[model samples]
Target: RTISEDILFRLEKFGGILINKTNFERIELDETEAFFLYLVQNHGIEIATSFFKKEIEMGKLERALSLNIYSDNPYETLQNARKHVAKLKKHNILSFPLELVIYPSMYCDLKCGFCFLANREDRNAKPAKDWERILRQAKDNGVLSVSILGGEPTRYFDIDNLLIACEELKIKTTITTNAQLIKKSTVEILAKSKYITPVLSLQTLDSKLNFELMGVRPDRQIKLAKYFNEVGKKCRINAVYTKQSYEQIIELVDFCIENKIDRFSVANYSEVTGYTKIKKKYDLADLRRLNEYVTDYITQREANLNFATEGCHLFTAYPELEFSEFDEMYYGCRAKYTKMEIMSNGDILPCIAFLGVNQTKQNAFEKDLLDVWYDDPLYGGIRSFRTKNSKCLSCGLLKICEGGCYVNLIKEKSPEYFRDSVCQL
Candidate 1:
């Protein structure tokens, strides 16, 4: 006759428990009476019990489901719980905004084969006058970090001024240079800036190869490293991985560690105009081999040194490597919307490659810089490209690759070529 006890007993048999009651009225009625009364009532026991006195006086049951429904719908409840966990994970990854990318200058002393900016000719280069405009745009867009790069940012006369400006804006700034101009005075100023962290491009420790590749006196680079170390400025080395230098991967890692430069970034060399191209001699198999070797070497070394690591440090000894998968994943390009390269000719580009495009020929200094960036068709094209090619969808390393570089994607002639081939996903 006690239906509540029978129902609860059956529920417990299925690995559940009745933990609490809805109200006193439900408790007041005997189990059989409550069950039968609830069946005949318009509302369930939960609502009837809460408004029992009024319901009984008014000759009708109240309206609401019983507490047991939660336990009764375990499958639905579990599904909802899993959904909440997934949402939390997604929210955690995209919580921060990426703010600024600064191209300090288009001047470079070297003529590396893969130079994306193609800034070898002095006449081809010019000064960046949209510093204020860039800063304002970044601030308005919630950009908290800035990356300063160039043919050689250190060669710019306004190098110090740029650093000072970044500091004034309270922006976290990073400098990418060949370290060819890291003199004592320059090192001192950079160290004091605190806002600027330098990333020296040291493709390989082989001075002869470096000299050959970069077309700079090896001694200048060595001196720059010494100066950077002497000033105790926090710095990292970026090693662009190419077929020519793939075998020297371990040596480069050791070099960084020996020099007390614990950060290094290994980027797969993508073919750029005027630089080297991935020749017909090499195939995707070769790239896979090199990637595996380098990835394995770094993994083993990291295991030996730290035993645990995260982010880019997992790939390099250097701690300052800004490992980005943005260019690969969502944007299909680097400079568009997120960053811009300012040429010495006062031309602004979403990236250095945009300088070569016919559309970005306007004098950056004379024009409204922000307007040019917003109105550019190339920038819009990149956005369109990413939307068309959802290459990241099938990528196992989507978290790491993001999408892949738009420049590289464009150069490769296909988005599929840049997908997570490394992971074979």
Candidate 2:
């Protein structure tokens, strides 16, 4: 038996699965077939090939059920015996989060129509001491990076403290901010802070559109963009397509290019209930058109604003299953298992939304990051939630999709197996 190709292996509800990423299909095995698969997965193709083929030729009813039972491919029997890995990883699977998304403050200097933090008053920001503990636990428990997100992380009184801690610890940090507050001093702090990547919030460049996207003065945002360019700090523009952004979408991209702002990303605005409610202007339909336009636009510009600059605009999830990229782009979501968010007051949430109000979840302040992460049974039902629907249960993407975004599912008050409103499949 010999092997030359890569086989994708992962835990699935059915059992251990081996995917021929080559063909985008998988094999679900019983204990008996698992042995044969083990040979192929561990050794090579010849181990069980001839054995299964002989049984198939003899018309053994059970042997025929192995895979294309009667098919000519001798590799069929070679596919068995891959046992399900008893454990998922080194740490407790449910508890160890991949990233730490901390909201250092809930205050914002500008109010945008699309601001999710609009209506709420600043509750109470966690002091830098508590945040230092957060960073400590995150590093010990294996957090990949810490994302300083919020109404505006720059508004945090101790932004530099946390920034410096991350730098000292060598924990990569991502800061998402409305650049208006990013002054020359702030840029200096950021410039010296190794491993910090800042994402500037600049939805649009027009005065009126700027209000719709956020309350930042266009001049202030532009000034900060120039400051970011001058400081030699790594940065990118985070734009959200709005009703108003359409008219000047091309101009927005051009603005980034003209200024030599190398990185850019577009995010879909999620709805905020209560007084903060705002209808998301762009949807799947718009994403297709915009993606094509932006992609082609950059294509024509070539070196001007290319993917190499980390400048390509992207879709977080497809509007629907219509495009070929849908299969590649939105195949799975890592929200609960790999990613999670903490509010300014220290609430650990499942996705972006379900928070302190949720009866099922406990706050990190109420517990520690370690307890909140893994040992508690309080999270898994909410985290591993899936649909009872036959279609979702049988879907090839069961592990990959994980029922799309849990926040969106909760927003729709959907039942298990509910299709992500944004996904085609």
For residues 129-180, write the lDDT of model 1, one tens digit per residue.
4576666555543354677776687887777767777767666678888876
Model 2 global lDDT (CA atoms, 0 to 1): 0.60
Q: Each prediction's TM-score against the native?
A: 0.57, 0.69
Superposition error at 358 for model 1 (Å):
2.6
Against the true structure, whose lDDT is highest? 2
Backbone clash count, each prediction separately: 24, 18
For model 2, residues 372-396, the per-residue Cα lDDT tens digits are 6654443565555666656556655
For candidate 2, the per-residue lDDT at 70 reads 20
RMSD of 2: 10.5
